[PDB]
Amino acid sequence: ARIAGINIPDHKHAVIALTSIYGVGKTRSKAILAAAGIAEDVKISELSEGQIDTLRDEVAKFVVEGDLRREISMSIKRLMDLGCYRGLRHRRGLPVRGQRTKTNARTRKGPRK
Amino acid sequence: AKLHDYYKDEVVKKLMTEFNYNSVMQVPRVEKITLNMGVGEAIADKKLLDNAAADLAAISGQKPLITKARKSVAGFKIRQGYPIGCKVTLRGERMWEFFERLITIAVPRIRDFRGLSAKSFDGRGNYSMGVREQIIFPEIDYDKVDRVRGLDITITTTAKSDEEGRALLAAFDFPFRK
Amino acid sequence: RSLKKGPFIDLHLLKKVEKAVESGDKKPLRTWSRRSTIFPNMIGLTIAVHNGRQHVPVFVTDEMVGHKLGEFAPTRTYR
RNA sequence: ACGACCAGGGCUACACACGUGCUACAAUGGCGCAUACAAAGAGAAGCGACCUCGCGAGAGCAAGCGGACCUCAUAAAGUGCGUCGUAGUCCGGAUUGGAGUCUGCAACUCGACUCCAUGAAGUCGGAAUCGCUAGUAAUCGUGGAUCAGAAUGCCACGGUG
RNA sequence: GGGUGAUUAGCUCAGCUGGGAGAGCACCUCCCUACAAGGAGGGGGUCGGCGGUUCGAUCCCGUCAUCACCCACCA
RNA sequence: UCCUCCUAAAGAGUAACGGAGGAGCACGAAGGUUGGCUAAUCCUGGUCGGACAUCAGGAGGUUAGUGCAAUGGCAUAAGCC
């Protein structure tokens, strides 16, 4: 139990603790289920050491675990100047993509008093 | 204690030889190692924290104690008999029984190295560390409804320069700055 | 790239941009359309961009990339 | 000259209260998988099959038919077998990141679409206001016009009760 | 100068043998028909100042500041 | 009324409706004894810890703790254990 899923429900479906975690969602969860060739319907296969933990290499070509944000957390510091539209909108909590502020902005502005 | 013969080669022996020393006493040694856990948490009802000390007693060479405070200045309205920690330190014989698996061979889930090495060292084992982020590995009675418990380590060495004593760390699962 | 491939410089700007490098002792180029594009390798030149009421002088840096003249530098304060 | 020509700009510039809508708040529901029963229209560098590349938007190669025939074109709700253990959740998806696909002088401001990650609210709505006496209140799916790119509004059509 | 009380929401005021910040009005916003009433929601607190003790003082205790009530006497 | 410091001029004695404060109890443990040990504060490193308790070291060494005001001592530790 918990050989890849980090949560205590160990008798349930192959999405539980195996999606939206450390750079893995449905599409990349399928890609390591495919790497080990195992079964997924109703429950994930009961498995031992040296069977799928050895195959994390077959899904490694993405930002994962300790590397999920590491280098972008330095690259995103590159623009900070107040005259730069991207610099200012990194230096303050603002959308670099641009949005409307007058009407239907209440998620970004948060709750009103 | 069944594992201590490695001390003649795997640690401090190349250091000993690159000064032409003849004794393990001319190079650093471990005075004491401490495995201390925190009890000062104030976010839930204090209900499962002695079984969290039993989870530490599954790897410590001495079982945790009740403990007492020394100050009563705190905003927690405590008496100086208030339990303040766990009191877990190893000297000599059962410290050779700790490195028998822990921080030496216990985890096969090694990481692709990006740079994270031992830090802030100065001249007396001046590096302190807790564990970061979850991967899960087998532990005793761990099918329990409680958050994942680790260990927070402190160590004291007979050193004067920890940068010179860097070979005392060579048998461990963690790296040192080049 | 994503906006129907390669960019285009409006001819009224393309006729006067390498004549600003290389600007002489004469005044910096005035531009009235903020819609005009600049290319990322452009550097070391001063230009004057219209905002609707004023003309704003700007020097082009190595940190300025392929912008429009409304994005590259603040032509109005404005709020 | 507030006339008229000429070029750039403005009409989603922001502060606060909405009128009418909409995905919903979970199980009169989702997730997975198979599957029944349609009308009305559009089609002269059109509609574009079969197949293929690309994670994908889209694009390549070229039949069929100038169109009761071919092509847009796998109706959905419903129906059958598994699953969820009622909790802001396997729910839900504003966000957040890196790069594309398509169009147009024009996409900062101010467009439509996509891939893999990534993430917060929402718990049936205060006084009150509105709809129907039956194919009626409610609800599911397909087209068309304007038109370079862009509607959830407009106009037709079929399903369930 | 002195005695006795007060100090908390804009106003009127609870909480006073040790922490839990609150009620009715008022204001703003909203519902009905023109103005109220009636019914909901919301904003905002050096809880006056300095010390004593205590983990902690709107609270207890001493002492300031500002206001009310009664005094400031013999010649 | 009982206590600390000054008032007080370095003997002894000592005044003031002289100047600053505490006490009205507390602990059978906070007493007895043998044996052992060494705190604060700051900094660096351990955060799942919400001003202050807390783990290791460097600097320091009755500056912390010593039941109370205040005075003074305490490593021989009267300190904590």
State the SS3 of A34-77: HHHCCCCCCCCCCCCCCCCCCCHHHHCCCCCHHHCCCCHHHHCC
Chains C+A touching (3+ CB pairs under 8 Å): yes
Q: Which residue shows structure tokens 């994962």?
A: A64
Provide the experimental method for this PDB entry: cryo-EM
Closest chain C CA to residue A98: C71
Among B108, B111, B145, beta carbon nearest to A66: B111
Among B108, B136, B145, beta carbon nearest to A2: B136
Q: Among residues B166, B176, B121, which one has the least CA distance to residue B15?
A: B166
Q: What is the nearest nucleotide to B70, using C1' and CA?
A: F53
Q: How far apart are CA A19 and CA A27, in angstroms?
A: 9
B177 is a domain residue: no
B104 is a domain residue: yes
Is the Cβ–Cβ distance between A70 and B114 less than 8 Å?
yes
Resolution in Å, one decimal place:
20.0
Q: Which residue shows structure tokens 């349930």?
A: A12
Structure-token pair, residue A81: 């100047």
Tell me the sheet residues that pair with A8: none
Structure-token pair, residue B167: 């070979």
Which CA distances in Å does A7 have to A3, A47, A51? 10, 16, 20
Element (H, E) at A29: helix A26-36
Assign A91 to helix, strand or coil: helix
CATH number at residue B81: 3.30.1440.10
Q: How far apart are CA A22 and CA B55, in angstroms?
A: 27
Q: Between the CA atoms of A89, C65, A74 and A29, what dihedral angle is there, to the nearest 10 degrees?
A: 90
Closest chain B CA to residue A7: B136
At position A35, the amino acid (one-letter code) is A
Whether residues B133 and A66 touch (CB distance < 8 A) is answered with: yes
Tell me which nucleotides of strand D come within 7 A of a protein CB: 7-10, 12-18, 55, 82-85, 90, 93-112, 115-120
B20 is a domain residue: yes
Neighbours of A72 (CB within 10 A): 11
B59 is a domain residue: yes
The residue segments making up the domain with residue B16 are: 3-172
CB-CB neighbors (< 8 A) of C73 in chain A: 83
Tell me which nucleotides of strand E come within 7 A of a protein CB: 19, 42-44, 55-56
Q: Are strands C29-31 and C46-50 parallel, antiparallel or unpaired?
A: parallel
C-alpha B77 chain-centroid distance: 31
Q: Which residue shows structure tokens 């429900």?
A: A9
Q: Among residues A19, A22, A21, which one has the least CA distance to residue A30?
A: A19
Residues of A with CB under 8 A from a CB of B: 1-3, 6, 8, 49, 53, 65-67, 70
Whether residues B134 and A70 touch (CB distance < 8 A) is answered with: no
Which CA distances in Å does B130 have to B37, B138, B150, C31? 10, 19, 8, 60
B149 is a domain residue: yes
CA angle, residues B164, B13, B103, in degrees to nearest 5: 75
- If one counts the domains in chain B, the total is 1
Is the Cβ–Cβ distance between C73 and C58 less than 8 Å?
yes
B49 is a domain residue: yes
B117 is a domain residue: yes
- Phi/psi at B30 (nearest 5 deg)? -85, 125
CB-CB neighbors (< 8 A) of C74 in chain A: 82-83
Which CA distances in Å does B42 have to A62, B46, B148, B151? 38, 8, 17, 19
B178 is a domain residue: no
| Strand ordering across the sheet containing C46-50 | C29-31, C46-50, C55-59
**Helices (H), ranges, B58-145:** 93-96
Assign C47 to helix, strand or coil: strand
Exposure on the CB side of residue A110, measured as CA atoms within 13 A: 2
Q: Among residues B101, B71, B98, B88, which one has the least CA distance to residue B152?
A: B88
Element (H, E) at C59: strand C55-59
